[PDB]
């Protein structure tokens, strides 16, 4: 006995490119035997932070779906990725539910997601009409209205383009470097399914 199909975690964690936080992607992991012990024992991950279900308990408890929400955020902003937190990333870009069951994986990515001259290809939303609901993948790009006067669809006074650039540099502190993130929000539903742990069969 053995696994039938290893889950595409390599496709997510080791992805060639990672999207901005305001347009965070979501890979619907489905119908596969997941090995989480390989992820936990890795020494690269600077933050695992499992919620609800303990990390070692994962390898014999299993669910209907697993969504690997992924984005890039500087290190000090990582704490906002959690239930009940508040902040620019929590309010305007990515809000986790107050009741949550996942594991916010992260790792340093200075050598990949940055270069000598810096990088401006990552964006984040700085203004919005109101707070996000949980898992609200809002990819709005319209000019934000900050007042009563109309903005005329163009930048100006009381009108700011909602997405600003992180703009990293290799000289930034370790807490300010680009840390990739993967969330792994588990789910149950009326339909049974078995995205589940390894066989563990010694024989």
């Amino acid at each position, epitope marked *: 006995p053995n696994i039938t199909n290893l889950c595409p975690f390599g496709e997510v964690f080791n992805a060639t490119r990672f999207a901005s936080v305001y347009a965070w992607n979501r890979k619907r992991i489905s119908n596969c035997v997941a090995d989480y012990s390989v992820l936990y*024992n890795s020494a690269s991950f600077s*933050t695992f932070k499992c919620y609800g279900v303990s990390p070692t308990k994962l390898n014999d408890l299993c669910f209907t779906n697993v969504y690997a929400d992924s984005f890039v955020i500087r290190g*000090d902003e990582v*704490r906002q990725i959690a239930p009940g937190q508040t*902040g620019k990333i929590a309010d305007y870009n990515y809000k986790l539910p107050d009741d949550f069951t996942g*594991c916010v994986i992260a790792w*340093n990515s200075n050598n990949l997601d940055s270069k000598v001259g810096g990088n401006y290809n990552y964006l984040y939303r700085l203004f919005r009409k109101s707070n996000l609901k949980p898992f609200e993948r809002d990819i709005s790009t319209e000019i934000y209205q900050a007042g009563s006067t109309p903005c005329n669809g163009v930048e100006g006074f009381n009108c700011y383009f909602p997405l600003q650039s992180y703009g990293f540099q290799p000289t930034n*502190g370790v807490g*300010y470097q680009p840390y990739r993130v993967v969330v792994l929000s588990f789910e149950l539903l009326h339909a049974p399914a078995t995205v589940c742990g390894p066989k563990k069969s010694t024989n």
Partner: antibody
Amino acid sequence: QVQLVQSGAEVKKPGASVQVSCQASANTFTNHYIHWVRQAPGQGLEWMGIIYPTGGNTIYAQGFQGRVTMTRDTSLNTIYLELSSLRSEDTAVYYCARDVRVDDSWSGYDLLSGGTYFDYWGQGTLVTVSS
Amino acid sequence: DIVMTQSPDSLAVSLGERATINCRSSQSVLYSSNNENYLAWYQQKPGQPPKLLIYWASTRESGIPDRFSGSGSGTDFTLTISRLQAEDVAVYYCQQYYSLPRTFGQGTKVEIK
């Protein structure tokens, strides 16, 4: 009965390797992170890195990204340095400051969030380098 | 990178009086979710390692007497030592644990009379 001690004073040549380390009671330091703090005699404190003791996930300051690697030993729960390319600026004391994780919500480790503050420090291990 | 410098480099304190140690951060350490100001205050005597006094912005850690006190929010914070009578001459460090790399302060020496 002091419950945190270091490996004692060390001396090394420039370009050599140094293994300042501190062994501690594993009964309580499975669930506490542990940092490393530098201080020159004339200057203030400086930061070097954080080690989650069991897993060994590590983060280093940008100033010493390519000069230090830190290991573990789950049996003893002791942690070491590998500070290399020693120079006159490297003469300093090295405390393996502890942390207390505040939140009971999340399981697992987080080197960016669950650090909080330095509740306990080790005795000084003064390192000197000379020709 | 949460750079930091205390306003008072060194202060001469008359014995038994109250002395304040202002401590300014470059970036606000206040976190909106729980509204706890992330600073802690340390003191090291010569030779001995530093000892924490106040772990959040205000509340003092167990085992220390109630002589010390700290208050403030945002970026302006102060350590107020009251009735400086014992031999508490030392260098006082305030440091952020809001984000890495934990930039400690340069430290200020307190002197008696």
